[PDB]
Write a protein that binds this ligand. Structure first.
Ligand SMILES: CCCCCCCCCCCCCCCCCC(=O)OC[C@H](COP(=O)([O-])OCC(O)COP(=O)([O-])OC[C@@H](COC(=O)CCCCCCCCCCCCCCCCC)OC(=O)CCCCCCCCCCCCCCCCC)OC(=O)CCCCCCCCCCCCCCCCC
Ligand SMILES: CCCCCCCCCCCCCCCCCC(=O)OC[C@H](COP(=O)([O-])OCC(O)COP(=O)([O-])OC[C@@H](COC(=O)CCCCCCCCCCCCCCCCC)OC(=O)CCCCCCCCCCCCCCCCC)OC(=O)CCCCCCCCCCCCCCCCC
Ligand SMILES: CCCCCCCCCCCCCCCCCC(=O)OC[C@H](COP(=O)([O-])OCC(O)COP(=O)([O-])OC[C@@H](COC(=O)CCCCCCCCCCCCCCCCC)OC(=O)CCCCCCCCCCCCCCCCC)OC(=O)CCCCCCCCCCCCCCCCC
Ligand SMILES: CCCCCCCCCCCCCCCCC[C@@H](O)O[C@H](CO[C@H](O)CCCCCCCCCCCCCCC)COP(=O)(O)OCC[N+](C)(C)C
Ligand SMILES: CCCCCCCCCCCCCCCCC[C@@H](O)O[C@H](CO[C@H](O)CCCCCCCCCCCCCCC)COP(=O)(O)OCC[N+](C)(C)C
Ligand SMILES: CCCCCCCCCCCCCCCCC[C@@H](O)O[C@H](CO[C@H](O)CCCCCCCCCCCCCCC)COP(=O)(O)OCC[N+](C)(C)C
Ligand SMILES: CCCCCCCCCCCCCCCCC[C@@H](O)O[C@H](CO[C@H](O)CCCCCCCCCCCCCCC)COP(=O)(O)OCC[N+](C)(C)C
Ligand SMILES: CCCCCCCC/C=C\CCCCCCCC(=O)OC[C@H](COP(=O)(O)OCCN)OC(=O)CCCCCCC/C=C\CCCCCCCC
Ligand SMILES: CCCCCCCC/C=C\CCCCCCCC(=O)O[C@H](COC(=O)CCCCCCC/C=C/CCCCCCCC)COP(=O)(O)OCCN
Lengths: 140, 53, 107, 459, 121, 70, 347, 56, 54
């Protein structure tokens, strides 16, 4: 639900690195669990044990990505003394991409992942700052 | 979408069965006839938004 | 391997045709000599004689709707008047300050 | 403006009801007449514009582009007459129909007074070009070429549409006159930055900007000769016209949003020019030279000064004529040799002297020899850039030298030296080809006598 | 806008009675001419698919094509004009009845407005 | 001669431009007003637009119902 | 089957749809859906073979599950308010159930899986009917209850449908599966605008129905169901291939064709509600549909594929049955952009 | 020979007729915008004794 | 000519787009056609819509 989003957002940007890291880890774990459920449903690989192994691998990868992003972004915002700045999120995003690239053990995904993730996190920070809506309400 | 054929022709194909308080056989009332009648009379001719508010 | 080594029934690639062989004085427009000659004539007449000469003459003699000589005359009259009465030629302000209401700062 | 639009539309029934052997003659004659009629748009004012109606208006920025567009059609018909000899009557009529539809879409696009109307016609120009490239192209790469030419374009122009409707929900109008008279500054904001990018990228991708130019060599080397002519002469200038029109609502963001592109252009013009030094295909070389010239036009538009705009207009017209002539010369070699490789047919000055003279004049014009209008545009842009920053001269200067080199390179490899011994099918030049080159080159030297016609609305 | 629930609307009327107070579209309306052109194109395509001489195969069929398109286009244009008239009528009535939501802006002159200047350098 | 047989005077284009500008400015103002009116009507529900149906009160039966308390 | 029985079944399908469209009672809407489903099964199975039977059972299972959840939503709505009229939904759980049931009836993602298989299994006439007529009733019901939809769920399913259609169409060589994925993407476009303007939904539905009718009739005329079979049509009737190429260009949203009208309008409407990111992503994703349309155009009319000798005999024969309204469908699906402001007719 | 060369050269009238029709179309558009004819502050003029409109 | 124009500028925009879209197409369309997995996925999405959007 939006409960995890509220727990992550209620923390101030430049404080409580541990809390932000924990919330990002929880969000990543939830996303990995959902992706694992879909993958298990659409592709039953060989058995129960292989399925639980795949679920655990996906969940750990997603949680690690979220944790690295949250920790790096919060640390950058704290030490740069410039909160509300999208470069911290970009830095966090790039780190997350790198974490994923290291997990998959290939440089192209890591390099590709770092650039794209950095862009997405910076865009999300810009949207928070400027008030961009992804799901707009029917105003007119 | 909705083509109001009944309203155009005055047919009453299914409106007789839409509410509790609409002409039951042998004049048997609904359990909540008065509340439904009051709510319908409050909301009539006003529109869904104003009726909800 | 009794295969014919032929992938399909296909026409051979034809050789290019020389227009000069069947018609010297070919002009390179068409294989029909009459149509070719008239294509040459219409192209030359409507391209060089009509557009290139008459259109160029038309453009050369376009009337002065950009108003260059009008601006020259106006500037001449203004310079004459301002030198006659001692006014300092062009003024630094485009609009006179009497009609501008600046905001009071009171800082 | 309908006095030009209606005859262009009447070209289609005239083409389709024509005799089987009279399509080229009628099309050429009536296209030349339409060009003569469109010549009257050149009478412009120093005041606002020629606002014919609520839908169409003309300016001294639009008038030379319209004249070039109407003049290019007869030349394209002449160039296409040769290689379409063995084609059925219906398909020849379809080819002429595609050319006419392209001319109609371009005519309307230049004169449209509404940004949305402009967008619709600016995209409508894609379909005829794509059909021409992928249907009457020669090699198998044409399909891939077409795909590139499409998706690049669309990838730039879908955001623009969004921005456009957004603007109309905020200002209330997309009419260019109202937009100009009611302009308001753009504050430095992330939303404004992305609106700027959406309004700019569609025109950048069609110039093309360096790094977004990969579609152009493919499309130009794979297209038939008429497609190459229209792509190099007119379709590139659509981005320049669009950026000239739309920059009025982008200030003062352009003061600092222009830095990434300016660099990408100023360095880019070097790279592409150097690319021309090592090229084994004539059409590829001519396309890369087009990229360099359009990089200079991009710099001119981003500088946003009167001299910059004058130089950009003049350079757009001059490059259109010059690149069309160069493509026609390369094709006249290709139809004899069927190779499209520079070092195959050599020493052609000995076998075709008048065509060698045409080659020399085209190379001199591409080299920007004064007082050609190519040099007029280049020099105005260079002076404006020098005022922008005195260091720019370095890069500009380098480009000049490099340009001359590769231009003369192309002239020396194909025309000078010894003829290739085994090539014995080089026939004398036809009257059609010589007339094509003459009709390309005479308007340039005539225009150098009245440069004010091509200097834009800021003259 | 959603005028589906607009009061006093007959459920299946193509053109209400109140639509008769508006000027009808002229028979030389450019949109009517475009509708006739669409009918002519339909007739030509019908000739081409059936493998008949495209221009001069069936003159009665082409005439019927054009006439049907023009007829439907005339009635469609009437309905469209009526709908836009209703939109404008409702807009003006609402603005009149809610004066506190549409105040008259105090007109100002450019000589007393301070607009920031950005040099181009 | 060219000006006499091919063109008109400046005032024609001047006043045509004035008329065109007036039309376009009126259209822009109308578009803004229409957007604001749509927003108000959808938010409040007190206008002719965005009227969503409620139960017709003519369907209610007003008769004794075999029970005094309805 | 017997022509009388076939006509009766078709009329029953249309009468079920019209009963859904004209009724104000939830039970009658459910009955209309039931009647439509009952009469639809024989039409799919008209040409008896194992593939058609399999497609019919898949369609039956999907539609029966959807109708069961629709009845459940109606009953929950009645429980929380003694109402049978189709209006505001009065309950969030009931409204979520109703939205999911109608999404599976329409084939929106993630309930899209049955559409490609059912379309591939059935013939081209049954596919035409299934992809055009079978969308009217659920979309009309969605339009009637648009003011109660949760926009988040609707927009999520619409964006998912656009993405899934675009990605799934890239991998297809069968023409019926290409049509199915195109239908999924167009359904996503239609439902992405329901929360803001139902007139835009109806306009998109009309344009899509015209284009789909034209393309299906062109495919029936040149009796081809694969890419390679369609690559032979130029050697018998090149006019059909040229018309199909122009129709495919229109279906890709390229201006100035008719298929540009919906997206344009929808984008505009979304921008009026301060929605910017979603229309941008939607156009970017429609680029994929355009790509595989262009691939079909490449293989069909823009190039000439090899033919076979026995094609010569086919040169001596003409189509015995000519489909009326095909020229009108082609013209309406290609050349109606200048008439765009007619949408105020509340089509 | 008249009535024989016509069947081949009637095509050559289409573009000039289109030109004349386009000029006529342009004139029609001009009439609609006469809202400020002889009303601008710059060209406001008193009519001549036999003048109805300043421009056409 | 070679490193930038023919390789890396080609690698960045067009080739990456083609690779990603083709991989996503293979991911989406590679389904065995078994209603088992389809309806299990339907159950999962029903639960997600029930417990995420309210
Ligand atoms: C628009 C105008 C014109 C523009 C022009 C175009 C310019 C843009 C394109 C430029 C592209 C350059 C970089 C591309 C990505 C490189 C990775 C890759 O391609 O994967 C393939 C490849 C992966 O294949 P693999 O199977 O894993 O192994 C292949 C090698 O043989 C095995 O190699 P290895 O195992 O020996 O590698 C060990 C070591 C490399 O060892 C070193 O000595 C290099 C370290 C420096 O790697 C590292 O430790 C990482 C550092 O990656 C590499 O091999 C090289 C990776 C290291 C290259 C560093 C990148 C250079 C600088 C990049 C930063 C510039 C700005 C980036 C912007 C970021 C935010 C937006
Ligand atoms: C210089 C004063 C001239 C006054 C007399 C009138 C000149 C008329 C020129 C007409 C325009 C150029 C026509 C080009 C197409 C030629 C067609 C052709 O095939 O003819 C074959 C014909 C028969 O020969 P053939 O036996 O068949 O030849 C066999 C082989 O093909 C062998 O053929 P080829 O080897 O004889 O090749 C032809 C020859 C000549 O062919 C060409 O090169 C033609 C193109 C040359 C210029 C290239 C573009 C440069 C930018 C020019 C922009 C200004 C344009 C001015 C207005 C032009 C209006 C059209 O090649 C050259 O000699 C190289 C020319 C390099 C010129 C470099 C200097 C250019 C700027 C000069 C300053 C101009 C402004 C001064 C301002 C300050 C003082 C007032 O021979 C000629 O007619 C040659 C004409 C002589 C060359 C004229 C060069 C000067 C005129 C330049 C443009 C007009 C300036 C007007 C103001 C003068 C003061
Ligand atoms: C802003 C736009 C403004 C202009 C609007 C443009 C559209 C307007 C027309 C729309 C469609 C209606 C007509 C087309 C029907 C198709 C029939 C056909 O194929 O032509 C055969 C026929 C001649 O052939 P035929 O000897 O009778 O029999 C041969 C068989 O038909 C069959 O011959 P075959 O089998 O031996 O040849 C096979 C050939 C045959 O294939 C085809 O030709 C099929 C035609 C293409 C499909 C049509 C698409 C539907 C409409 C969409 C238009 C898209 C416009 C959007 C812009 C994008 C541009 C693509 O196919 C191929 O060769 C395969 C290669 C494919 C090449 C690339 C495909 C590109 C197609 C795109 C065409 C778009 C423009 C077409 C213009 C008109 C074409 C006739 O053409 C005609 O002569 C009729 C054309 C119109 C008649 C005008 C007469 C009226 C003049 C009276 C006086 C002037 C009026 C002014 C009044 C004031 C005076 C006082
Ligand atoms: C080959 C061997 C030699 C033989 C020839 C010997 C004779 C040499 C003469 C040739 C050039 C020598 C230069 C002499 C120049 C004299 C003419 C010049 O003065 O006229 C110019 C005029 O030139 C024209 O203005 C420019 C030509 C127009 C170009 C339009 C192109 C035609 C349409 C083609 C299609 C368009 C394609 C390109 C689209 C942009 C400038 O005149 P200007 O002082 O100012 O005012 C004219 C008089 N006024 C005051 C009454 C108005
Ligand atoms: C590939 C071939 C070429 C294609 C064309 C390339 C041209 C497009 C380049 C885009 C132009 C620049 C975009 C944004 C420029 C604004 C200036 C800003 O970025 O600089 C600093 C901004 O700092 C950091 O840049 C923050 C953003 C960091 C994250 C962005 C990603 C960085 C590299 C990404 C490049 C990827 C491009 C390709 C995408 C696929 C200024 O600090 P600050 O005063 O605080 O912000 C001022 C702006 N305000 C006023 C709105 C607040
Ligand atoms: C000594 C002479 C030196 C100068 C030479 C000048 C050469 C002139 C040729 C260039 C023509 C310019 C193009 C003009 C076309 C557009 C202008 C148009 O608006 O004028 C129309 C008139 O159209 C002209 O008749 C077009 C002339 C085009 C024909 C060119 C002549 C030669 C062409 C060759 C034809 C084929 C020859 C036969 C071969 C077998 C009337 O429009 P209108 O809206 O009312 O104007 C309102 C202003 N009023 C009030 C003054 C009337
Ligand atoms: C490709 C373009 C679409 C083509 C569509 C098919 C064309 C053939 C159909 C022939 C005309 C059908 C009209 C039926 C006659 C009377 C209709 C009347 O009784 O009903 C009215 C309704 O009339 C129709 O809605 C108008 C149909 C006109 C369609 C034209 C619009 C097309 C969009 C613009 C593209 C240009 C197309 C022009 C060339 C055909 C009253 O509607 P109402 O019961 O109170 O409200 C229910 C509808 N709501 C819910 C949406 C409000
Ligand atoms: C989020 C979704 C974003 C959607 C972006 C849409 C991009 C539009 C193009 C999509 C095409 C993807 C499909 C594809 O290319 O397949 C690879 C294909 C394999 O060949 P096939 O013809 O499929 O099979 C032949 C063997 N039988 O390879 C190709 O042919 C590549 C040629 C086409 C590419 C042309 C250039 C496209 C990219 C240009 C840059 C624009 C990118 C747009 C998005 C960028 C972000 C703003
Ligand atoms: C050749 C390929 C090029 C591809 C196109 C590159 C250009 C991309 C430009 C951005 C895309 C979206 C443009 C948005 C349309 C303009 C509308 C606008 O500006 O409104 C903004 C909305 O701005 C946005 O939302 C934009 C967010 C970005 C989302 C889409 C991301 C696309 C990719 C971004 C990075 C790439 C951009 C540069 C690419 C360079 C070329 C590769 C304000 O919204 P409001 O909420 O109403 O006002 C704020 C006050 N309440």
């Amino acid at each position: 639900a939006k409960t995890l989003l509220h727990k992550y957002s209620d923390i101030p940007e430049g404080t409580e690195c541990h809390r932000k890291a924990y919330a990002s880890t929880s969000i990543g774990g939830a996303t990995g669990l959902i992706v694992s459920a879909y993958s298990i449903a659409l592709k039953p690989p060989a058995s129960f044990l292989e399925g639980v192994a795949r679920t655990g691998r996906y969940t750990f990868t997603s949680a690690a990505i979220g944790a690295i992003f949250g920790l790096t972004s919060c640390i950058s915002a704290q030490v740069r003394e410039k909160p509300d700045d999208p470069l911290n999120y970009f830095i966090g995003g790039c780190a997350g991409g790198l974490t994923l690239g290291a997990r998959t053990r290939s440089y192209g995904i890591g390099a590709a992942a770092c650039a794209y993730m950095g862009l997405t996190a910076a865009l999300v920070k810009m949207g928070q700052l400027e008030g961009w809506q992804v799901f707009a309400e029917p105003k007119v | 979408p909705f083509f109001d054929v009944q309203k155009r022709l005055g047919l009453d194909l299914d409106r007789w069965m839409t509410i509790q308080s609409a002409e039951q056989p042998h004049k048997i009332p609904g359990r909540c006839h008065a509340f439904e009648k009051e709510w319908i009379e409050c909301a009539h001719g006003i529109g869904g938004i104003r009726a909800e508010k | 391997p009794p295969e014919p080594t032929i992938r399909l029934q296909e026409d051979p690639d034809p050789e290019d045709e020389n227009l000069y062989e069947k018609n010297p004085d070919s002009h390179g427009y068409d294989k029909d000599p009459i149509v070719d000659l008239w294509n040459m004539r219409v192209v030359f007449f409507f391209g060089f004689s009509i557009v290139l000469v008459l259109g160029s003459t038309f453009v050369a003699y376009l009337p002065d709707y950009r108003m260059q000589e009008w601006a020259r005359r106006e500037a001449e009259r203004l310079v004459k008047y301002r030198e006659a009465n001692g006014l300092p030629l062009m003024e630094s302000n485009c609009f006179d300050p009497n009609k501008i209401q600046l905001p009071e700062d009171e800082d | 403006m309908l006095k030009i639009i209606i005859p262009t539309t009447m070209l289609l029934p005239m083409t389709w009801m024509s005799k089987h052997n009279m399509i080229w003659i009628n099309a050429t004659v009536h296209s030349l007449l339409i060009s003569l009629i469109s010549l009257s748009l050149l009478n412009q004012l120093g005041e606002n514009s020629l606002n014919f109606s609520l839908t169409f208006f003309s300016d001294s920025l639009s008038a030379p582009l319209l004249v070039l567009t109407t003049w290019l059609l007869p030349l394209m018909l002449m160039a296409s007459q040769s290689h379409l000899s063995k084609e059925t009557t219906t398909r020849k009529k379809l080819y002429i129909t595609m050319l006419i539809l392209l001319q109609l879409f371009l005519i309307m696009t230049f004169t449209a007074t509404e940004l949305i109307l402009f967008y619709i016609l600016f995209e409508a120009t894609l379909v005829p070009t794509l059909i021409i490239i992928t249907r009457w192209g020669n090699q198998t790469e044409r399909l891939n070429a077409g795909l590139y030419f499409l998706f690049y374009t669309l990838a730039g122009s879908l955001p623009l549409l969004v921005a456009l409707v957004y603007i109309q929900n905020t200002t209330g109008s997309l009419n260019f006159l109202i937009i100009h008279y009611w302009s308001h500054p753009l504050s430095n904001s992330w939303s404004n930055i992305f609106m700027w990018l959406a309004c700019i990228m569609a025109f950048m991708v069609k110039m093309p900007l360096y790094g977004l130019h990969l579609w152009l060599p493919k499309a130009h080397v794979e297209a038939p000769i008429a497609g190459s002519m229209v792509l190099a002469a007119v379709l590139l200038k659509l981005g320049g016209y669009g950026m000239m029109r739309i920059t009025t609502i982008l200030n003062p963001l352009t003061n600092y949003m222009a830095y990434p592109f300016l660099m990408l252009s100023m360095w880019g013009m070097i790279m592409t020019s150097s690319i021309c030094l090592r090229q084994t295909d004539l059409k590829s070389l001519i396309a890369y030279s087009s990229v360099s010239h359009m990089a200079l036009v991009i710099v001119a538009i981003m500088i946003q000064t009167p001299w910059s705009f004058m130089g950009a207009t003049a350079l757009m017209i001059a490059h259109g004529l010059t690149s069309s002539m160069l493509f026609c010369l390369a094709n006249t070699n290709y139809e004899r040799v069927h190779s499209r490789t520079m070092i195959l047919a050599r020493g052609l000055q000995t076998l075709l002297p008048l065509m060698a003279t045409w080659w020399l004049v085209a190379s001199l014009t591409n080299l920007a020899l004064p007082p050609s209008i190519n040099l007029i545009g280049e020099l105005f842009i260079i002076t404006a850039s020098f005022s922008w920053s005195n260091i720019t001269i370095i890069l500009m200067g380098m480009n000049m030298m490099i340009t001359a080199l590769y231009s003369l390179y192309m002239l020396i490899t194909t025309q000078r030296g010894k003829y290739t011994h085994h090539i014995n099918n080089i026939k004398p030049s036809f009257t059609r080809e010589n007339a094509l080159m003459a009709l390309h080159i005479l308007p340039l030297l005539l225009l150098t006598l009245n440069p004010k016609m091509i200097l834009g609305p800021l003259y | 806008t959603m005028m589906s629930g607009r009061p006093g609307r007959v459920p299946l009327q193509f053109l209400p009675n109140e639509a008769r107070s508006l000027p009808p579209p002229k028979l030389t309306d450019p949109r009517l001419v475009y509708m006739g052109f669409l009918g002519y194109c339909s007739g030509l395509i019908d000739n081409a698919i059936r493998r008949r001489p495209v221009v001069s195969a069936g003159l009665h069929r082409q005439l019927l094509y054009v006439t049907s398109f023009v007829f439907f286009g005339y009635y469609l244009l009437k309905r469209q004009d009526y709908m836009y008239a209703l939109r404008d009528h409702d807009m003006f009535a609402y603005v009149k009845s809610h004066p506190e939501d549409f105040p008259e802006k105090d007109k100002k002159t450019y000589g007393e407005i301070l607009e920031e200047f950005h040099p181009v350098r | 001669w060219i000006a006499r047989t091919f063109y008109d005077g400046p005032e024609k284009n001047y006043e045509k431009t004035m008329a065109i500008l007036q039309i376009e400015a009126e259209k822009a103002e109308l578009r803004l007003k229409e957007l604001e009116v749509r927003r108000l009507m959808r938010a409040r529900g007190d206008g002719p637009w965005y009227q969503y149906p409620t139960i017709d009160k003519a369907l209610i039966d007003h008769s004794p119902k075999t029970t005094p308390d309805n | 089957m017997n022509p009388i029985i076939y006509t009766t079944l078709i009329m029953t399908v249309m009468s079920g749809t019209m009963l859904v469209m004209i009724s104000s009672h939830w039970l009658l809407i459910w009955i209309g859906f039931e009647m439509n489903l009952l009469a639809m099964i024989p039409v799919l199975m008209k040409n008896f073979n194992p593939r058609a039977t399999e497609a019919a059972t898949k369609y039956f299972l999907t539609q029966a599950t959807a109708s069961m959840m629709l009845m459940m939503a109606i009953i929950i709505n009645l429980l929380y308010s003694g109402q049978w009229t189709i209006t505001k939904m009065f309950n969030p759980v009931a409204m979520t159930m109703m939205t999911m049931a109608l999404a599976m009836k329409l084939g929106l993602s993630p309930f899209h899986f049955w559409v490609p298989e059912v379309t591939q299994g059935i013939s081209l006439q049954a596919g035409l009917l299934l992809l055009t007529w079978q969308k009217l009733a659920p979309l009309s019901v969605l339009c009637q209850i648009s003011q109660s939809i949760n926009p988040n769920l609707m927009l999520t399913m619409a964006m998912l449908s656009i993405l899934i259609g675009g990605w799934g169409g890239l991998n297809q060589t069968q023409l019926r599966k290409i049509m199915a994925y195109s239908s999924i993407a167009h359904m996503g476009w239609m439902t992405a605008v329901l929360p803001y303007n139902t007139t835009m939904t109806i306009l998109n539905l009309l344009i899509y129905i015209t284009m789909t009718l034209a393309m299906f009739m062109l495919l029936i005329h040149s009796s081809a169901t694969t890419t390679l079979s369609l690559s032979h049509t130029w050697n018998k009737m090149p006019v059909i291939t040229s018309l199909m190429m122009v129709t495919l260009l229109s279906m890709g949203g390229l201006p100035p064709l008719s298929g540009f009208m919906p997206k344009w309008m929808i984008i505009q409407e979304m921008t009026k509600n301060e929605s910017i990111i979603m229309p941008t992503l939607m156009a970017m994703t429609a680029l994929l549909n355009l790509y595989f349309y262009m691939r079909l155009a490449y293989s069909s009319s823009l190039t000439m594929f090899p033919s076979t000798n026995n094609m010569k005999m086919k040169w001596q024969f003409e189509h015995t049955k000519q489909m009326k309204l095909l020229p009108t469908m082609i013209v309406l699906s290609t050349l109606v952009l200048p008439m765009t402001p007619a949408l105020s007719s509340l089509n | 020979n008249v009535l024989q060369i016509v069947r081949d050269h009637w095509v050559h009238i289409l573009v000039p007729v289109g030109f004349v029709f386009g000029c006529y179309l342009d004139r029609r558009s001009d009439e609609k915008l006469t809202a400020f004819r002889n009303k601008s502050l710059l060209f406001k003029r008193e009519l001549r004794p036999n003048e109805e409109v300043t421009w056409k | 000519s070679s490193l930038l124009d023919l390789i890396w500028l080609e690698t960045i925009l067009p080739k990456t787009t083609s690779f990603i879209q083709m991989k996503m197409s293979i991911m989406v369309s590679n389904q065995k056609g078994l209603i088992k997995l389809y309806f299990l996925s339907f159950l999962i999405t029903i639960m997600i819509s029930m417990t995420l959007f309210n």
